[PDB]
């Protein structure tokens, strides 16, 4: 169990009696009055102590990255890397070291939706034995901006207008697309916000970056250049956008349910750890240079190595003492790994810890359990609001003749203390600039957009017709297609007819044709369709319902999570179609004798909204998702005028549909469904 | 050990590696830097996680009694009280409850002097298996005020006045007489802190007291009225002003190390608790309203049960996670123990559960180890700043299904719940009033200042004249002359001198000639001698440094803490006649030999300042203290006009020294050293 | 007025009714109760508004510097100072910049004795209208300490022990002392607060200086390292050892009132500000490093050059 050290601050409250905060068992339902019908008394220290803890249960989201959700468990190294790094948690084949990782969102504030578009967070703790190691990443490998000074500039950009507080958890706006604009930087990290990557099936289905490029330590101080990236062993898989926006009113909590979900039904997710090695030598070897958080390294040129697995397979007990306490840093460093002089990192390191002080209104934040090393902590700290410990040493200071020497010195050579890694020097003037070498705010962009399909391309481009046909600035709508422009004139110009706009004429700088892998999220089927949900619409009339328990039955037995759905929770029903929605399903399939809620009398129930099981079965096509209908059912397919000869479309028997359905559900999504310009 | 539920939360570091907050052994002695004379690199992790937790260490000082000091110890209960009360640490014989207490001034601030003239503070937790019971008082009966809307008025006039942030940790200045005249209900507390309640010797030398009636209610809800006495078993004792305030000088954490130093050498303190029980239907029985916090009940009236015992034994291992940290409340109560109408403690339930908030900036301050009960916590509290616990039960919220109705409701008959009085009531129109049975300011105080010794009468005059006479306003100063010429025309005109003012005529509304036992301190002698200390004053020249070893053996076999002092840390001295202060001691005593330093050349060695020895000498005579002088060390004595004839003064041989010294300190101070008008 | 700009935050009560703060005139001396001698009630807005603010006066007190006192003024410079450095305050003769300066001791809490030996700070702030600028200095010219990162535990061992918080504003217990012979780079500042300038006779009577060297930079980027000096007009004095002892239980407030006293009777404190300036080769020229605080530039290698008042 990956929360066994937590164990021993659980509070069970099963069979005993109410108490206040100070001990003493009390009632507390009643208001203490002066007399039958009287004031409450100010005496009645009961009734003070309970709402004044209720008064202050809030403390501030996080100022970025507010709105998540996330889960224990266990990383499993499958070497000894000793070769590569001093880091203990990769120092021996199946050495095991907990983790903690948090999935979220970026610009929502905490109860937005979690299939807003963005860029997404995918932050993971090691708890080490020789202390806390974050890897603070996000499920895109580029960041928007090159240097940490810019970061409160680009997030009140995104962020909603101040003067509104308009709109939530959105890009679609206009000081948005001013900052992209005025940023080129920018343009990388946009343009995979606007893929699928913005807009993932699940947390499962991420991959995660830790984006810059940091360095592995060996024990004699020789470094690596490294990248860190998470593979998922779920595949990754995305939404649409029409289906995201349903979605993120029907549920806002799709993709924390779904981990939690994934994780309580014995279906722990997991990722391996993998790490592009280069020597320091190439920093600037490959057309950009490695200390540019806007660009990554292409697998063609560094392939990925695997250095052990991630699963996660515990749920928080408290969500706000475990998940929304936990303070993550990438200054939270341990021996084996170092910093590079990448100007975005460099900035985060004090922005994390300093950030703690205002989220946690105090100086021993780190006190708190979920954020507890598991390796001992042995300093001269003292004091500070919420001060846990007691502290048995009275000589809190070194140098000193009278506590011995202890807490000692550690480093490089004694203790296996943190050490810099040694051959780092400093050359040159002091400067407030960036490096010319960080100037191509444009190649890359050409890059991952060339690495996509087709429809991944339209994709793309009809995000940016979305949200740039949202800016009011005429003008603002003018330096998007400029900036477009320099990285691919077909995009300018397809985004331009959305806007009624002439995109600018070719500027052939930054063209090319490259491509590289890895990048693309539709054009792989899944490894495995395990807790893929498939909506079986039914009914309560006639003999439909016994042949979807079957149906069922048989899904499920091959790792489906299926939901049986009727007009009302009869026997062997999951949910009403009152309840339901596509939005909530992978795959939808009609269950013979169910035609009839499709037309005539059937479909139009007090029970349920007009259109409803019609309205399903339309989402789950247009949405791309596998569709079927058993049997007779098929008149519900020719309803809506969707044939059983399409791709991903299926009919017959229980075994046809079921084979083919868990066919499709490995493409996930049928794009022959989805218009291309031209 | 009473600290034992905190051997869980302490941190050795002994014999380790040095870590960051998040684990990982590092250095911290260097800043990163970037090239030999380099800037400091803002990648330097560990210079920034030090200097953070460093520069975030101070918490707000408490409102009021910042400056304190506390112990663990262990209460014993003498009785099964049940027919009294409910309370489960006071529900068998040799019952044992853990304690922890902090004693404290009221004005100053963190740093100011234990020796400060102040009401004191007298905060005693019980650890119960029923929940923590707080009782929070001081070391005087009765407060400034009627009602607690009137606490910040009382506190701003006493603090230092706000322009310039003087005088600190006193009451000599123009607010705060300005304060006791226009509110007269101020003169009680007022005449107690001008007594040498307001000076005390040590923390183990006071009385304490709850001030408020409260009331112990019995399993079947009968009540009775109660007053909360802490009996010093030391003793009380308290110093001269003149000496006070050198002290506050020379050391301002007099009482916190006699408090440490008590405890580390074995002789723990104990108080015995002790209360008045009163018939509900006598509240107004004893000529004042018992509701009112200005009086006290007098003895002879009530006297006092004895419920049990508390020893303090053992000191905290961290001041700061323990004595700073604790958070005391008068709300901080347990089954078998109630409110009653008092306005000032009315107000107070509120005032300590809110100002946690500030000190602790948070709502789990209960979390912190020095303030969680050991009788276990089970409610639908969730989250707030610095939730330190996970909670098992998802359903947090009554009444409901799901949760099978865990945490369950506990009353008078079910779980052993608190419930309020049954039978108390409530009657009469809504009012910002205060009943007309408060009105009397000044019957108490005559009879507090009647029931004084008359050098401890003269001791209260005195105060009273050196304070005001640092009113500039000459108008307050007569106000104040009026106020205490209600009490007592003979003490308004002696005050009225210093003033150079003249006394109002006598007006008799209030005057009488009662008296009350037991507020006096200077006229018992006291019950014990060991801890006090006996400064010797010896030299490093001849023979005098061995017998002044020989003296301090005997000495110390009879329990006393013994300093030889002498020029220079020579073997067997343990003070510097440079460090050296007589208001350190209780006693102070010339080996033979040492009268050289008395006199000549010998009284002025580079080595401490000019007169030091004398000076000592001549401070403990005039402060009242035994002194005295071995052999041919009685010329010291001579030195400064002082015959061996005096009382409290002994000459001759060793025997004969040690045997005076030792009665001498049972009487503590020699009163008739001290002139009377 | 070098205090005018606050003077639209002052807010005055004279004559003026009682009021909530969020106003609406009250009375507040008495409790709302239930009855003639009744519980008070829960609804009495007025109490809780008031005693709440009370129960949340106090604020955390400086980490160090705890106890001190300071006063408003005004600096004039004695001239245009272009040639050495950029700086708006400095730039011309006359020139007038309102200041605020913090006089302290250094380890003691807020309710300390002023004349506890200690090194004193000397913190002054320029208002300048080319934003706030601070000399952040002591009464001492060198510091105990060579690297920041030693600041926890050179402030730790002064203060008083962990376990009973003994002793309150001295140096004279077993840690520091530790300390200091551990640490050696702290023997010269310990001279110092040995010395005279550990027990001055009043703020009036201190120097004050910046510690560090810093640079002067003109508008054409050259730069000159640079000494900071405040040089008391009333004179440099001190008490002796065994004074400074009564006078802290006598009057903790001796040195706040001291210099309370000297403005409200019209003898406003002057002190001059000086340089020593040292060009940027001779960095290391005297006989040690002058990015070492540990170390003083002596007057006979660089005069001291007033520039203001
Ligand atoms: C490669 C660039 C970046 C990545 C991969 C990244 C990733 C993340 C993630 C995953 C979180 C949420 C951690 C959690 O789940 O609690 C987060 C929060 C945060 N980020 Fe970053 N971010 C980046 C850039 C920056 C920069 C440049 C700054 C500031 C200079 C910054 C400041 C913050 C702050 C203050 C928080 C809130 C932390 C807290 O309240 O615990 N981030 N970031
Ligand atoms: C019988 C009258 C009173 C007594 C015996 C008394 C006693 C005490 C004592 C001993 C302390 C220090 C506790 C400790 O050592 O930490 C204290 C603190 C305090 N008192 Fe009282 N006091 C009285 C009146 C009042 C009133 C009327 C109020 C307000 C309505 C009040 C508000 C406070 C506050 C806010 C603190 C700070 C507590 C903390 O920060 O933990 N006191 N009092
Ligand atoms: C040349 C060396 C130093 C000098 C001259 C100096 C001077 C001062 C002065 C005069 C103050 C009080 C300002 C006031 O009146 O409010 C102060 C406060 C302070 N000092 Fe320093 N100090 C020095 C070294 C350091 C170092 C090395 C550190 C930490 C790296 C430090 C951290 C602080 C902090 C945290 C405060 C509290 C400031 C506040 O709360 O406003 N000091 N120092």
Known sequence: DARQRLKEVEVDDNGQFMTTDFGGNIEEQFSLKAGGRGSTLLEDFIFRQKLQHFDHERIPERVVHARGAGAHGIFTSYGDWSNITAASFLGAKDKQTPVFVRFSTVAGSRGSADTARDVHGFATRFYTDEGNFDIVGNNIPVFFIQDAIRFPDLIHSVKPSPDNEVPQAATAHDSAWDFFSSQPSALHTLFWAMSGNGIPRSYRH??????????????????????????????????????????????????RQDLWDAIESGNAPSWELAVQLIDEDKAQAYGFDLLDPTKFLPEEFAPLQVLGEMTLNRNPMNYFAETEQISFQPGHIVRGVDFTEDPLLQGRLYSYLDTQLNRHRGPNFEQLPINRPVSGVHNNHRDGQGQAWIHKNIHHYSPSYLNKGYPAQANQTVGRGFFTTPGRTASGVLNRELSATFDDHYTQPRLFFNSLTPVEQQFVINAIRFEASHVTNEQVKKNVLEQLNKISNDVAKRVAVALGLEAPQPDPTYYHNNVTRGVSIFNESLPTIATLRVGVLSTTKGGSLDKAKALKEQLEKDGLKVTVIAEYLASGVDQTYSAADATAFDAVVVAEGAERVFSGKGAMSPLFPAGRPSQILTDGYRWGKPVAAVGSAKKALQSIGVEEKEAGVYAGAQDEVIKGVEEGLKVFKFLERFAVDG
């Not at 940091?214 to 004699?220: N, P, Y």
């Not at 995201?244 to 009113?249: D, E, I, M, S, T």
């Open 206 to 255: 991420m991959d995660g970056f830790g984006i810059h490029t940091f360095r592995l330590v060996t024990e004699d101080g020789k470094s690596k250049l490294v990248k860190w990236h998470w593979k998922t062993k779920q595949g990754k898989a995305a939404l649409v956008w029409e289906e995201a926006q349903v979605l993120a009113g029907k549920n806002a909590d799709f993709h």
